[PDB]
DNA sequence: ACGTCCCTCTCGA
RNA sequence: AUCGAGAGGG
């Protein structure tokens, strides 16, 4: 059945910061993609098995983390990045505010 | 599952926005599209080093990506390029591609009017976003020539009403030309750093010089894949082809024989093809059909349904339920009665601990077919082990650690609800009464903050996979706790119908018990004194 | 970069959520096998093995609450009231 | 249009409602930082009423013969009558509660006097009386000294918003404020010996009770008060217009200056179907 | 050279872990992973210093798992060659081409091309040795070799060097 | 002054039908209207414009293009806002995810 | 998990990690860490015979062996690449007992020169600066000569008899 | 504050006189005030160090403070500059005397 | 410019 | 299977 906005929504209300994560991740989509440290973009190629993580175009093989997301986000992303626009994702911060 | 990873699992913080230098593009890329032609090397199950996986992701469920050499779930795509041969608008930056040829001198590309100006100096300060872009053009549409110094800022030319006759950009003089798209970007390019800056732009996320694309993006087979109906590509497939074909044309049509009036048509049909797969309710135009109208990405991503209404602000859920809801006076506010073909099918993670382990192998020991069974178990080495069918679904003694997906039962954090749903007393939780007949049975005085009835409405319920969740869903989403509405700051349920009507049939001093009745009366209540 | 507690200013009592994550997050850790301290009355179930622990402030958890300009002030379960 | 428009505001820990990006909405949600359940809607005895009667349930004189408390409603009976050290609190008594009787009629000018607030003081004390067990003849044993300092220090201590610095703390008084007056009004240092026959212990239960019930009261940080916001005002409309059918057309269901009257207020739009002054 | 940073590692523990000696554990657990390692960015991580007093800071349990991170910041020994550092070493793989030296925990190559023209190679020899006019280098013996060039290969980062510059060999 | 007005003309729709509702609730909208200048609107181009999260935003009427406009003008999403966890399969800053959790062996030794 | 931080040839051409403005585990501005091959062997053995005394709270080529106790005790031998250091820096470090290194260090620094250097310095027994200053490129106008090789004959003095 | 009681054209000139910017009001709006209104609550000026202590004590930046306009009808009734900022006091249903404070641009 | 939430069927390229 | 159109259920 479709949890659907206007349940994301009375849950919002409610407070079920966590279950509301769990409703939209664990009980469908979820992923693990690799991104990168400077092109915030899933493009790393994940030879695990082996503990080779590259991301060619910017040489590095070290600046590398791994997230979960929704694999539709992750989708939305590959579309958007199709229309040539880049977001990138990041983990560190710099604004505070 | 997925295979462990020895990178840092992190979270997203920041989401920066930019725009792919058509070089970030032909270097990111793994191999380079070429070819139009799907997987068909033969018409054979095996790929093609043109289009699709030539190092992009593989098509078929057991073969593997010729890059990163994992299994589809867990390659997420690749994406390669298609060189262009001549730059091509962005069927979306259009207007604001224009917009900033109204604000920059087409010959020798510094702003139109500079840092001499009393609304010029005064928008230029408007540190706001892009307000001051806006400000910067209204205040620069007009002047039409560049300067030698004025009451010195270089060149001098005369700047063209550029107006917008679909796809292309027009540009008389008081003699009359059409802008194109290989003179247009050389004016970006030449945009001075300083320029596009207090303009609206960025020196490295969004150069504007950007909104014209060179290299193209090839998005890999999970955007658009295709299905066996001997397959059948997807309609953003298809599409790449036709500019894949549409460029081809062009980029032998400025090669060998070049007669301009040739030229001039399929390089703005290549800019239709490219335009076409991103945007595709354009203007006027003809809204290119697919030997129909054809899907465009931008409305793939459109409200209502499509990855942001429809699969992100919401999705659908394994572990929901659904059924006729009938209501029940011999049953509590706060549980709700789920029929046994729920609870068996309705699982639910938990973990193998000395405190329940005495409880687990009796459940696993009974199985799917039986009420309080098992339809899974996890070990450490976490691969599924089916009970329905598992050989050694016989013994099977437990580990400690381990995770009996077990069945559902009595008095279990369930998230209940019914469907208009526009307000938080419309999903409270529940405990489970595991009953009967294929009927969600409910508390007669819990209808209300659901509007509820008993004459044909289905109702919904969830099931939290985790402890945590359980307590979120126990703690603060329970239908107790919710006895009182903030809405309107009274209780949002009561008495009613049969209880409601007779209770004042009972509350008359006409109304009298006699000694038998009494005591029924008086057991019935869970909570008796047992003084008469 | 922090807040000196003898300068806190939040709410000195719990919160519905606090608390609530915090029943349900040791409930989590318990049912995950963990160490309890407490000491077992007789409860299979790991809710109620945690809502012992909160009745006898026996579990090690701070609550780090942040405030809109960035900064956190710590409060120990130890510490906290429990009313509502 | 609503919920993804408030979304995002939920109080926070200072007690702010606010938003994605720091700004405020509120410095105080409901202005009172008061949660919506913990609320019911008692009268205010303060202010509704003849200047006449006011002073006989609320003022009482000790330099007077006849104007006092006759020892029947408090064991310091005679050894107060006279008594002025103390005709002076009773005094800056029942200039704060005329402070008050104005105050409101500067807020509460439709001559409104039933409000929603937390605490039902109006049952707290036949709670009180119930569970201690008052006697309406033999009288109480409070000091005047007890009473009106202790409703003093009651206010003391109903905390809203903690803080150091006198802007919070300014803050602070403002939110009580309307509270307060509800005290005064209704531990008033005639009523709990005249009406209430208080004991000594059963007031300062009372006193205690109180002073719990509200910070109970108080809000959470972490209420997603938006999000919440929105489905309060959103509900309603869609059930003034979803249960229409149940008559047979007559008058104001969902098609007369109501749901539409909201259509115009949140999208504004000058065009206005219906202007009107309305002039004095 | 030798270096001494202040390095920072995340760990995180299962719940079962978390009451009796967490430090103990996530103490050995750093060095489970730290200790004995090599990269490019610091190079060889090889000692951890300064034990008792190492941080652990406070613990964050993660959200919808049941565990914990810590950032852990350790200060330890570091080894990082750069190129043209010269370093003084022993031998251990004499090949024909040229003879491998350990220095440290890397291990500098050096070629027949970069010996000076006088590095006659002999195989008929127990053990494995290089002639020349005057001295002989062989299995166990000690040179002063100059880095050219480094390179990171996993979890180590071998290098080639020099003898042909003056004030080298002569040990 | 406004407000005042904007509020009463709120509040006479809604206890006209009866019904009723607390203060707060309007109050809050009204608020979020007028503390901006002056009634900024409840529509795409009213609130929605605003300088907030981008993926926040697009979850509303505009939702292609504002990506757009961001992807070119280097916009940037801060991550507090609920949606951009939502899409984001993150639990978001709400309730029970407004603060963090922390251990302390010092309590973890008293307690032992 | 993977080891953070906080933040090219011989001609101090270091990393970002390894420049000399490195920041403290405090974060205040505090200079670097380049230490010799005896300033190294000892910082080691000190810092392993603290471990010992910890988990037990729960001469010549002599060296070789009783520090080879500790790599097997002190540090499980996980850790192919600790081993060979600690060996490698006995056989090639040039000072025995702590005195004398202080010493060593008291007169590096009072040149100023770079870390590098005043590591690479005490650890190639240099005989004249043209050895000195060739192996050590950076130098060159950094130090006369003369002033180097009256550091570089002291330097000669006070190397431990082994 | 120079009033004008009908009409003045752009001949404009009125910001030039650093350091003096010149209220200009009207008599056809000054015959009725607009503060005495039942529904015009008590906006306070605030100073330079009565503002760098809301912008402290409620941990702000600028930004995030409501605002008020150059143009309102009481920021002119005041004159309100921008970063001028305001404590616009009022009866409340509930608080019985909220305190909100608005910036002006 | 978007145009209430969800759900069950049945049928033509 | 996918998109397109159609009748009903709260
Ligand atoms: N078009 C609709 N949109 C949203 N909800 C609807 C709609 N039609 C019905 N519902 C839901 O169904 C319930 C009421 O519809 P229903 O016709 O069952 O009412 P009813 O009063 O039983 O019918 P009757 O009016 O004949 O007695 C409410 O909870 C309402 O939200
Ligand atoms: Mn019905
Ligand atoms: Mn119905
Ligand atoms: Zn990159
Ligand atoms: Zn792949
Ligand atoms: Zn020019």
Same mark, same amino acid.
């Given at each position: 059945?479709?949890?659907?906005?206007?349940?994301?929504?009375?849950?919002?209300?409610?407070?079920?910061?966590?279950?509301?994560? *769990?409703?939209?991740?664990?009980?469908?989509?979820?992923?693990?993609?690799?991104?990168?440290?400077?092109?915030?973009?899933?493009?790393?190629?994940?030879?695990?098995?082996?503990?080779?993580?590259?991301?060619?175009?910017?040489?590095?093989?070290?600046?590398?983390?791994?997230?979960?997301?929704?694999?539709?986000?992750?989708?939305?992303?590959?579309?958007?990045?199709?229309?040539?626009?880049?977001?990138? =994702?990041?983990?560190?911060?710099?604004?505070?505010? | 599952?997925?295979?462990?990873?020895?990178?840092?699992?992190?979270?997203?913080?920041?989401?920066?926005?930019?725009?792919?230098?058509?070089?970030?593009?032909?270097?990111?890329?793994?191999?380079?599209?070429?070819?139009?032609?799907?997987?068909? +090397?033969?018409?054979?199950?095996?790929?093609?080093?043109?289009?699709?996986?030539?190092?992009?992701?593989?098509?078929?469920?057991?073969?593997?990506?010729?890059?990163?050499?994992?299994?589809?779930?867990?390659?997420?795509?690749?994406?390669?390029?298609?060189?262009?041969?001549?730059?091509?608008?962005?069927?979306?930056?259009?207007?604001?591609?224009?917009?900033?040829?109204?604000?920059?001198?087409?010959?020798?590309?510094?702003?139109?009017?500079?840092?001499?100006?009393?609304?010029?100096?005064?928008?230029?300060?408007?540190?706001?976003?892009?307000?001051?872009?806006?400000?910067?053009?209204?205040?620069?549409?007009?002047?039409?020539?560049?300067?030698?110094?004025?009451?010195?800022?270089?060149?001098?030319?005369?700047?063209?009403?550029?107006?917008?006759?679909?796809?292309?950009?027009?540009?008389?003089?008081?003699?009359?030309?059409?802008?194109?798209?290989?003179?247009?970007?050389?004016?970006?390019?030449?945009?001075?750093?300083?320029?596009?800056?207090?303009?609206?732009?960025?020196?490295?996320?969004?150069?504007?010089?950007?909104?014209?694309?060179?290299?193209?993006?090839?998005?890999?087979?999970?955007?658009?894949?295709?299905?066996?109906?001997?397959?059948?590509?997807?309609?953003?497939?298809?599409?790449?082809?036709?500019?894949?074909?549409?460029?081809?044309?062009?980029?032998?049509?400025?090669?060998?024989?070049?007669?301009?009036?040739?030229?001039? /048509?399929?390089?703005?049909?290549?800019?239709?093809?490219?335009?076409?797969?991103?945007?595709?309710?354009?203007?006027?135009?003809?809204?290119?059909?697919?030997?129909?109208?054809?899907?465009?990405?931008?409305?793939?991503?459109?409200?209502? +349904?499509?990855?942001?209404?429809?699969?992100?602000?919401?999705?659908?859920?394994?572990?929901?339920?659904?059924?006729?809801?009938?209501?029940?006076?011999?049953?509590?506010?706060?549980?709700?009665?789920?029929?046994?073909?729920?609870?068996?099918?309705?699982? %639910?993670?938990?973990?193998?601990?000395?405190?329940?382990?005495?409880?687990?192998?009796?459940?696993?020991?009974?199985?799917?077919?039986?009420?309080?069974?098992?339809?899974?178990?996890?070990?450490?080495?976490?691969?599924?082990?089916?009970?329905?069918?598992? &050989?050694?679904?016989?013994?099977?003694?437990?580990? %400690?650690?381990? &995770?009996?997906?077990?069945?559902?039962?009595?008095?279990?954090?369930?998230?209940?609800?019914?469907?208009?749903?526009?307000?938080?007393?419309?999903?409270?939780?529940?405990?489970?009464?595991?009953?009967?007949?294929?009927?969600?049975?409910?508390?007669?005085?819990?209808?209300?903050?659901?509007?509820?009835?008993?004459?044909?409405?289905?109702?919904?319920?969830?099931?939290?996979?985790?402890?945590?969740?359980?307590?979120?869903?126990?703690?603060?989403?329970?239908?107790?706790?919710?006895?009182?509405?903030?809405?309107?700051?009274?209780?949002?349920?009561?008495?009613?119908?049969?209880?409601?009507?007779?209770?004042?049939?009972?509350?008359?001093?006409?109304?009298?018990?006699?000694?038998?009745?009494?005591?029924?009366?008086?057991?019935?209540?869970?909570?008796?004194?047992?003084?008469? | 970069?922090?807040?000196?507690?003898?300068?806190?200013?939040?709410?000195?009592?719990?919160?519905?959520?606090?608390?609530?994550?915090?029943?349900?997050?040791?409930?989590?850790?318990?049912?995950?096998?963990?160490?309890?301290?407490?000491?077992?009355?007789?409860?299979?179930?790991? $809710?109620?093995?945690?809502?012992? /622990?909160?009745?006898?402030?026996?579990?090690?958890?701070?609550?780090?609450?942040?405030?809109?300009?960035?900064?956190?002030?710590?409060?120990?379960?130890?510490?906290?009231?429990?009313?509502? | 249009?609503?919920?993804?428009?408030?979304?995002?505001?939920?109080?926070?820990?200072?007690?702010?409602?606010?938003?994605?990006?720091?700004?405020?909405?509120?410095?105080?949600?409901? @202005?009172?930082?008061?949660?919506?359940?913990?609320?019911?809607?008692?009268?205010?005895?303060?202010?509704?009423?003849?200047?006449?009667?006011?002073?006989?349930?609320?003022?009482?004189?000790?330099?007077?013969?006849?104007?006092?408390?006759?020892?029947?409603?408090?064991?310091?009976?005679?050894?107060?009558?006279?008594?002025?050290?103390?005709?002076?609190?009773?005094?800056?008594?029942?200039?704060?509660?005329?402070?008050?009787?104005?105050?409101?009629?500067?807020?509460?000018?439709?001559?409104?006097?039933?409000?929603?607030?937390?605490?039902?003081?109006?049952?707290?004390?036949?709670?009180?009386?119930?569970?201690?067990?008052?006697?309406?003849?033999?009288?109480?044993?409070?000091?005047?000294?007890?009473?009106?300092?202790?409703?003093?220090?009651?206010?003391?201590?109903?905390?809203?918003?903690?803080?150091?610095?006198?802007?919070?703390?300014?803050?602070?008084?403002?939110?009580?404020?309307?509270?307060?007056?509800?005290?005064?009004?209704?531990?008033?240092?005639?009523?709990?010996?005249?009406?209430?026959?208080?004991?000594?212990?059963?007031?300062?239960?009372?006193?205690?009770?109180?002073?719990?019930?509200?910070?109970?009261?108080?809000?959470?940080?972490?209420?997603?008060?938006?999000?919440?916001?929105?489905?309060?005002?959103?509900?309603?409309?869609?059930?003034?217009?979803?249960?229409?059918?149940?008559?047979?057309?007559?008058?104001?269901?969902?098609?007369?200056?109501?749901?539409?009257?909201?259509? @115009?207020? $949140?999208?504004?739009?000058?065009?206005?179907?219906?202007?009107?002054?309305?002039?004095? | 050279?030798?270096?001494?940073?202040?390095?920072?590692?995340?760990?995180? $523990?299962?719940?079962?872990?978390?009451?009796?000696?967490?430090?103990?554990?996530?103490?050995?657990?750093?060095?489970?992973?730290?200790?004995?390692?090599?990269?490019?960015?610091?190079?060889?991580?090889?000692?951890?210093?300064? %034990?008792?007093?190492?941080?652990?800071?406070?613990?964050?349990?993660?959200?919808?798992?049941?565990?914990?991170?810590?950032?852990?910041?350790?200060?330890?020994?570091?080894?990082?060659?750069?190129?043209?550092?010269?370093?003084?070493?022993?031998?251990?793989?004499?090949?024909?081409?040229?003879?491998?030296?350990?220095?440290?925990?890397?291990?500098?190559?050096?070629?027949?091309?970069?010996?000076?023209?006088?590095?006659?190679?002999?195989?008929?020899?127990?053990?494995?040795?290089?002639?020349?006019? +005057?001295?002989?280098?062989?299995?166990?013996?000690?040179?002063?070799?100059?880095? +050219?060039?480094?390179?990171?290969?996993?979890?180590?980062?071998?290098?080639?060097?020099?003898?042909?510059?003056?004030?080298?060999?002569?040990? | 002054?406004?407000?005042?007005?904007?509020?009463?003309?709120?509040?006479?729709?809604?206890?006209?039908?009866?019904?009723?509702?607390?203060?707060?609730?309007?109050?809050?909208?009204?608020?979020?209207?007028?503390?901006?200048?002056?009634?900024?609107?409840?529509?795409?181009?009213?609130?929605?414009?605003?300088?907030?999260?981008?993926?926040?935003?697009?979850?509303?009427?505009?939702?292609?293009?504002?990506?757009?406009?961001?992807?070119?003008?280097?916009?940037?999403?801060?991550?507090?806002?609920?949606? *951009?966890?939502?899409?984001?399969?993150?639990?978001?800053?709400?309730?029970?995810?407004?603060?963090?959790?922390?251990?302390?062996? @010092?309590?973890?030794?008293?307690?032992? | 998990?993977?080891?953070?931080?906080?933040?090219?040839?011989?001609?101090?051409?270091?990393?970002?990690?390894?420049?000399?403005?490195?920041?403290?585990?405090?974060?205040?501005?505090?200079?670097?860490?380049?230490?010799?091959?005896?300033?190294?062997? $000892?910082?080691?053995?000190?810092?392993?015979?603290?471990?010992?005394?910890?988990?037990?709270?729960?001469?010549?080529?002599?060296?070789?062996?009783?520090?080879?106790?500790?790599?097997?005790?002190?540090?499980?031998?996980?850790?192919?690449?600790?081993?060979?250091?600690?060996?490698?820096?006995?056989?090639?470090?040039?000072?025995?007992?702590?005195?004398?290194?202080?010493?060593?260090?008291?007169?590096?620094?009072?040149?100023?020169?770079?870390?590098?250097?005043?590591?690479?310095?005490?650890?190639?027994?240099?005989?004249?600066?043209?050895?000195?200053?060739?192996?050590?490129?950076?130098?060159?106008?950094?130090?006369?000569?003369?002033?180097? *090789?009256?550091?570089?004959?002291?330097?000669?003095?006070?190397?431990?008899?082994? | 504050?120079?009033?004008?009681?009908?009409?003045?054209?752009?001949?404009?000139?009125?910001?030039?006189?650093?350091?003096?910017?010149?209220?200009?009001?009207?008599?056809?709006?000054?015959?009725?005030?607009?503060?005495?209104?039942?529904?015009?609550?008590?906006?306070?000026?605030?100073?330079?160090?009565?503002?760098?202590?809301?912008?402290?004590?409620?941990?702000?930046?600028?930004?995030?403070?409501?605002?008020?306009?150059?143009?309102?009808?009481?920021? =002119?009734?005041?004159?309100?500059?921008?970063?001028?900022?305001?404590?616009?006091?009022?009866?409340?249903?509930?608080?019985?005397?909220?305190?909100?404070?608005?910036?002006?641009?």
């Amino acid at each position: 059945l479709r949890f659907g906005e206007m349940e994301r929504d009375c849950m919002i209300a409610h407070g079920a910061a966590s279950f509301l994560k *769990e409703r939209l991740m664990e009980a469908s989509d979820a992923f693990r993609v690799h991104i990168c440290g400077i092109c915030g973009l899933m493009t790393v190629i994940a030879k695990l098995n082996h503990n080779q993580f590259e991301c060619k175009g910017c040489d590095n093989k070290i600046d590398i983390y791994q997230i979960h997301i929704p694999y539709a986000a992750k989708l939305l992303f590959q579309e958007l990045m199709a229309m040539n626009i880049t977001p990138r =994702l990041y983990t560190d911060r710099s604004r505070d505010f | 599952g997925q295979q462990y990873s020895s990178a840092p699992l992190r979270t997203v913080k920041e989401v920066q926005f930019g725009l792919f230098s058509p070089e970030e593009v032909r270097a990111i890329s793994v191999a380079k599209i070429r070819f139009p032609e799907t997987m068909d +090397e033969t018409q054979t199950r095996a790929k093609i080093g043109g289009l699709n996986d030539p190092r992009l992701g593989s098509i078929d469920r057991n073969l593997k990506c010729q890059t990163c050499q994992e299994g589809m779930n867990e390659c997420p795509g690749h994406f390669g390029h298609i060189d262009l041969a001549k730059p091509v608008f962005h069927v979306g930056f259009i207007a604001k591609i224009k917009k900033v040829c109204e604000c920059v001198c087409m010959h020798c590309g510094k702003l139109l009017l500079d840092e001499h100006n009393e609304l010029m100096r005064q928008a230029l300060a408007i540190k706001d976003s892009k307000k001051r872009f806006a400000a910067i053009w209204t205040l620069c549409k007009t002047k039409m020539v560049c300067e030698t110094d004025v009451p010195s800022r270089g060149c001098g030319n005369t700047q063209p009403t550029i107006r917008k006759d679909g796809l292309k950009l027009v540009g008389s003089w008081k003699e009359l030309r059409v802008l194109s798209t290989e003179e247009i970007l050389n004016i970006f390019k030449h945009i001075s750093v300083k320029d596009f800056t207090s303009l609206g732009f960025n020196e490295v996320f969004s150069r504007p010089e950007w909104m014209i694309l060179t290299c193209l993006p090839v998005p890999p087979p999970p955007v658009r894949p295709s299905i066996s109906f001997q397959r059948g590509e997807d309609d953003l497939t298809f599409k790449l082809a036709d500019i894949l074909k549409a460029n081809i044309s062009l980029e032998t049509l400025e090669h060998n024989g070049a007669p301009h009036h040739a030229i001039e /048509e399929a390089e703005s049909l290549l800019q239709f093809h490219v335009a076409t797969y991103m945007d595709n309710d354009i203007a006027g135009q003809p809204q290119a059909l697919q030997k129909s109208p054809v899907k465009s990405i931008r409305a793939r991503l459109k409200g209502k +349904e499509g990855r942001i209404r429809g699969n992100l602000m919401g999705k659908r859920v394994d572990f929901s339920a659904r059924t006729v809801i009938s209501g029940d006076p011999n049953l509590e506010l706060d549980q709700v009665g789920v029929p046994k073909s729920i609870a068996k099918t309705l699982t %639910y993670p938990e973990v193998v601990t000395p405190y329940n382990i005495d409880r687990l192998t009796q459940l696993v020991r009974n199985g799917p077919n039986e009420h309080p069974g098992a339809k899974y178990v996890i070990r450490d080495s976490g691969d599924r082990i089916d009970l329905r069918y598992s &050989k050694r679904a016989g013994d099977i003694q437990l580990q %400690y650690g381990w &995770k009996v997906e077990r069945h559902i039962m009595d008095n279990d954090p369930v998230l209940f609800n019914r469907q208009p749903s526009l307000h938080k007393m419309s999903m409270m939780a529940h405990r489970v009464k595991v009953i009967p007949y294929s009927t969600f049975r409910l508390n007669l005085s819990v209808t209300s903050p659901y509007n509820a009835d008993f004459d044909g409405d289905e109702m919904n319920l969830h099931v939290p996979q985790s402890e945590e969740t359980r307590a979120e869903l126990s703690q603060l989403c329970a239908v107790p706790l919710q006895i009182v509405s903030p809405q309107s700051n009274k209780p949002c349920m009561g008495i009613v119908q049969d209880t409601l009507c007779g209770i004042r049939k009972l509350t008359l001093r006409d109304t009298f018990i006699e000694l038998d009745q009494v005591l029924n009366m008086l057991y019935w209540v869970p909570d008796w004194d047992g003084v008469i | 970069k922090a807040i000196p507690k003898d300068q806190r200013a939040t709410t000195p009592y719990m919160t519905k959520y606090e608390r609530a994550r915090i029943l349900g997050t040791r409930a989590l850790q318990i049912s995950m096998n963990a160490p309890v301290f407490v000491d077992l009355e007789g409860e299979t179930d790991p $809710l109620r093995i945690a809502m012992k /622990e909160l009745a006898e402030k026996k579990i090690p958890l701070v609550i780090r609450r942040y405030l809109p300009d960035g900064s956190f002030e710590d409060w120990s379960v130890e510490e906290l009231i429990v009313d509502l | 249009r609503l919920v993804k428009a408030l979304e995002d505001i939920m109080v926070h820990y200072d007690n702010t409602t606010r938003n994605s990006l720091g700004n405020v909405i509120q410095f105080i949600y409901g @202005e009172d930082g008061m949660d919506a359940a913990h609320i019911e809607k008692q009268s205010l005895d303060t202010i509704g009423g003849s200047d006449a009667a006011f002073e006989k349930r609320y003022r009482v004189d000790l330099l007077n013969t006849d104007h006092t408390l006759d020892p029947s409603l408090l064991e310091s009976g005679s050894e107060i009558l006279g008594d002025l050290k103390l005709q002076v609190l009773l005094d800056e008594e029942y200039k704060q509660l005329v402070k008050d009787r104005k105050f409101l009629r500067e807020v509460f000018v439709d001559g409104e006097a039933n409000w929603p607030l937390p605490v039902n003081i109006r049952r707290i004390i036949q709670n009180a009386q119930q569970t201690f067990h008052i006697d309406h003849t033999k009288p109480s044993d409070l000091t005047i000294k007890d009473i009106v300092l202790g409703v003093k220090d009651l206010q003391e201590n109903l905390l809203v918003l903690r803080g150091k610095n006198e802007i919070i703390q300014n803050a602070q008084r403002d939110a009580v404020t309307l509270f307060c007056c509800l005290l005064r009004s209704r531990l008033a240092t005639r009523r709990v010996l005249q009406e209430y026959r208080l004991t000594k212990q059963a007031f300062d239960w009372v006193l205690s009770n109180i002073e719990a019930q509200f910070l109970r009261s108080v809000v959470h940080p972490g209420e997603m008060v938006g999000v919440l916001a929105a489905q309060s005002i959103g509900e309603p409309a869609t059930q003034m217009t979803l249960n229409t059918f149940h008559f047979a057309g007559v008058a104001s269901k969902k098609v007369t200056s109501g749901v539409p009257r909201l259509k @115009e207020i $949140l999208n504004v739009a000058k065009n206005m179907k219906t202007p009107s002054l309305t002039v004095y | 050279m030798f270096f001494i940073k202040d390095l920072s590692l995340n760990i995180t $523990l299962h719940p079962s872990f978390f009451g009796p000696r967490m430090k103990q554990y996530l103490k050995t657990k750093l060095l489970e992973e730290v200790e004995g390692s090599c990269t490019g960015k610091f190079g060889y991580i090889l000692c951890v210093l300064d %034990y008792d007093n190492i941080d652990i800071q406070r613990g964050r349990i993660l959200p919808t798992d049941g565990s914990a991170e810590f950032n852990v910041k350790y200060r330890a020994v570091v080894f990082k060659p750069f190129k043209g550092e010269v370093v003084d070493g022993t031998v251990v793989s004499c090949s024909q081409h040229g003879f491998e030296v350990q220095v440290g925990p890397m291990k500098v190559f050096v070629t027949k091309h970069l010996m000076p023209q006088d590095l006659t190679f002999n195989a008929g020899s127990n053990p494995p040795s290089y002639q020349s006019s +005057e001295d002989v280098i062989t299995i166990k013996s000690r040179i002063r070799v100059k880095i +050219e060039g480094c390179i990171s290969q996993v979890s180590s980062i071998h290098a080639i060097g020099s003898i042909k510059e003056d004030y080298l060999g002569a040990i | 002054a406004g407000r005042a007005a904007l509020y009463k003309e709120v509040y006479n729709v809604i206890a006209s039908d009866g019904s009723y509702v607390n203060y707060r609730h309007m109050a809050l909208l009204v608020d979020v209207m007028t503390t901006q200048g002056g009634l900024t609107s409840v529509t795409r181009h009213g609130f929605n414009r605003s300088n907030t999260g981008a993926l926040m935003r697009c979850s509303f009427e505009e939702t292609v293009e504002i990506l757009f406009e961001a992807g070119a003008s280097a916009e940037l999403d801060d991550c507090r806002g609920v949606s *951009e966890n939502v899409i984001l399969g993150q639990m978001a800053p709400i309730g029970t995810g407004a603060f963090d959790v922390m251990i302390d062996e @010092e309590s973890l030794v008293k307690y032992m | 998990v993977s080891t953070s931080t906080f933040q090219n040839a011989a001609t101090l051409q270091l990393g970002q990690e390894f420049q000399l403005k490195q920041i403290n585990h405090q974060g205040e501005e505090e200079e670097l860490i380049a230490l010799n091959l005896s300033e190294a062997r $000892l910082v080691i053995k000190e810092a392993l015979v603290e471990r010992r005394r910890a988990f037990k709270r729960s001469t010549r080529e002599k060296e070789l062996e009783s520090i080879d106790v500790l790599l097997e005790q002190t540090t499980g031998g996980n850790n192919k690449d600790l081993k060979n250091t600690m060996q490698y820096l006995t056989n090639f470090s040039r000072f025995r007992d702590q005195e004398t290194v202080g010493a060593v260090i008291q007169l590096l620094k009072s040149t100023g020169l770079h870390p590098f250097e005043v590591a690479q310095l005490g650890s190639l027994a240099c005989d004249t600066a043209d050895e000195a200053k060739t192996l050590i490129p950076s130098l060159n106008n950094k130090i006369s000569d003369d002033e180097l *090789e009256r550091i570089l004959k002291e330097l000669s003095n006070l190397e431990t008899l082994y | 504050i120079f009033v004008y009681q009908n009409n003045i054209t752009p001949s404009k000139l009125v910001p030039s006189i650093p350091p003096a910017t010149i209220e200009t009001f009207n008599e056809a709006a000054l015959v009725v005030n607009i503060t005495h209104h039942e529904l015009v609550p008590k906006h306070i000026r605030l100073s330079s160090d009565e503002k760098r202590e809301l912008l402290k004590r409620y941990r702000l930046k600028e930004s995030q403070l409501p605002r008020i306009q150059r143009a309102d009808p009481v920021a =002119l009734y005041l004159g309100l500059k921008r970063g001028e900022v305001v404590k616009i006091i009022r009866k409340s249903e509930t608080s019985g005397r909220y305190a909100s404070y608005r910036i002006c641009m």
